[PDB]
Design a protein around this nucleic acid. Structure first.
Lengths: 123, 169
RNA sequence: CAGCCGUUGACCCCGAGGUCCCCUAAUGGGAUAUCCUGCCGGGUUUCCGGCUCCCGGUUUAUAACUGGGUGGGAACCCCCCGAACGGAAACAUCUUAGUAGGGGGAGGAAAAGAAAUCAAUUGAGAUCCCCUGAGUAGGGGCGACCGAAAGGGGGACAGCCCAAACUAAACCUGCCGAUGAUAAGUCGGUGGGGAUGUGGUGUUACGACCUCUAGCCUGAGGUUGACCUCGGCUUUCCUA
RNA sequence: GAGGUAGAGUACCAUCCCCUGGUUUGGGGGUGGGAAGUUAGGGGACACGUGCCUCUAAGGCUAAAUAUGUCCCGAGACCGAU
RNA sequence: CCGCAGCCUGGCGUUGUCCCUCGGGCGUUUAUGCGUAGAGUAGGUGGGAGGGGUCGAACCUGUCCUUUCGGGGGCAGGGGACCCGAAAGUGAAACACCACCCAUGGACGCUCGAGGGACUAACCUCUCGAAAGAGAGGAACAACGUCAGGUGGGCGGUUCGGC
């Protein structure tokens, strides 16, 4: 795809899936892209998720660029269907956001460290 | 409001066009008429009331560019009405798009249309297409109008937005 | 001619039914045959149901199977394509003319319908048709000719939904059973669709609408002058 | 009081063509370019500028007021069997 | 008398990437200037008698390039600090600082030509392939659309005076 710039390893992705599913009860998590983008526009986003299997690619293509100047980190996950299951949704999910990391805060921060250190190597 | 940002990338000019050129080629391989389960640029489709609820569908179609496909006359005529070059199909291609699109699924009805891409040899459009016989839409208060007959086959009489546009209201 | 039905209520007329061959848009398949001819499932003697292009479901991801757009109709209506004859005393621009006619598609009416409208001393207030405005404006070898609008006067005069900001699964829908007057709805199980956006409020200009802040302002209850929950009300649907 | 929303190849422009009075001024289409988008735009007879005035499209949908005789009642300065 | 097909050429769009020589430029990067009178390189207009000055100068001594070898311009060390005048000439003066123009060369991202070349990914031709998809040759051409010009009894309407 073209809307994704840097590759994310599965093991990194796997942790995110475990990270988000924990937030089912403690943290506050946005589901559905509309509930995300404005919150991202509200600069209230701690971390956001962008699916690698979107169709067409433009459906969420704006999200990385906006988060740039907003200086808010973002993560990728290949299986958007899992994320819908991951967010406790009976159907697929393409965009979810993390207002607060809830219980996996430390897990989140390591992920932020994980992605950012890759970003440094990603130039 | 994703729909606000979808064209923020693609408002008039973006390197998105290079990507679509790749999509442009593969579509020429695709049939001249086909069904896409999810409409492309929702900023238009939802702007035409399309609801992802069961009972709607998306269709793509292409047409050839150029002036009108008009034959030369042969009888005795005055020069006024017998020239050929410069003619054009008076009713717009945006209009014509739904027409052949309408014929494809007569058990449905057309509402609105738009193009998404265009090269020098073809024009590519996307059209909302609605089932009225579905026992879902049958009970909608918000579209109860469609239960009547008169809403049928409208595009052929030009009661769609394109028809109104072709009529220059 | 001959015979019968009729006072056990005929024939007739009204309504409700029942039958209702073949081709035919004819659609199991085929047709220069108003005719022949298969495949399933049903009971079964006679026989009965289903079999182009689609929409949404069953089952494998191509196999069949569940459930619902075609043609005609006197004129009329809408929309695309689009003539010559003549006239100019000729004729080529023009006009005759978007009529004759072609194609598509409806209904009992259609179309259109809520201004990016006008006009002009700061006014009116959807559309349509009728009478005027008016052969006025304006167009054209300035030739035949074509030809408005605004306003006024009449008729009926009805005006509501969507996208966005903003709520965010609070959503719609198949079947079965119960209930419900069989309706709608609700209930229990079910199947489908849906964050790639259902449902909730709302769509208008010297602004409108939404959110937040602050202040004032309802019958019961509670909460901390203030807030909230349950009242009437608006819209919609359902027909016994 | 503060903040936010308010429809794109759409408007618009050049060109060719079509038609309507629309004429250096209208609407439609083809072709090529091509915006702003609320602190937006358009319109107010050539163009441009300035002020003043009024509307908000590029999606819907809509009661009635009129078009007609395949037909059915009624009437008639309509004809009497070429 | 003309009109319309078709044809030829060219422009625009479907039109991509590397270039390549030269001529153009676009927004930039920079650096180079003696008709005579005179301390002397006044190229021509501006604000400007102050500008440089451990917020580093005058002096002479060489390495170096150039030029009407006239002469100016760029090098650090030797030198730790000095010169132009509001004063003398020039139809037009300050190598007092900073600007504009002409004029010489190279380069940067972009554009156009005289053009030329190359590639393939568009696209075209063909084949295989049930489909999906694959392979082979040309090629940003061709072909199409559109526009213009040249040709155009191939087709269409017409007139072919009057006495």
């Amino acid at each position: 795809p073209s809307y994704v710039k840097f590759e994310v390893p599965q093991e990194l992705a796997d942790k995110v899936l475990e990270a988000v599913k924990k937030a089912k009860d403690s943290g506050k998590i946005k589901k559905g892209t509309n509930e995300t983008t404005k919150a991202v526009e509200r600069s209230q986003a701690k971390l956001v998720v962008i699916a690698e299997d979107v169709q067409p690619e433009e459906i969420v293509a704006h999200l990385p660029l906006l988060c740039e100047e907003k200086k808010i980190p973002y993560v990728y996950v290949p299986s958007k269907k899992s994320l819908g299951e991951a967010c406790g949704l009976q159907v697929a999910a393409a965009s979810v956001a993390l207002m607060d990391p809830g219980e996996a805060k430390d897990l989140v921060d390591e992920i932020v460290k994980r992605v950012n250190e890759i970003k440094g190597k990603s130039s | 409001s994703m729909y606000h940002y979808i064209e923020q990338t693609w408002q008039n000019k973006d390197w998105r066009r290079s990507i679509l050129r790749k999509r442009l080629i593969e579509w020429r391989r695709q049939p001249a008429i086909t069904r896409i389960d999810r409409p492309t640029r929702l900023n238009r489709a939802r702007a035409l009331g399309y609801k992802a609820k069961q009972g709607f569908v998306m269709v793509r179609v292409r047409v050839r560019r150029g002036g009108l496909n008009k034959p030369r006359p042969n009888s005795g005529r005055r020069p006024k009405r017998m020239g050929v070059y410069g003619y054009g199909p008076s009713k717009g291609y945006r209009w014509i798009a739904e027409e052949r699109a309408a014929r494809k699924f007569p058990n449905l009805e057309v509402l609105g249309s738009y193009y998404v891409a265009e090269d020098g040899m073809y024009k590519y459009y996307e059209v909302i297409m609605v089932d009225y016989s579905h026992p879902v839409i049958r009970s909608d208060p918000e579209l109860k109008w469609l239960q009547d007959s008169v809403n049928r086959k409208r595009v052929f009489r030009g009661l769609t937005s394109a028809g109104q546009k072709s009529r220059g209201l």
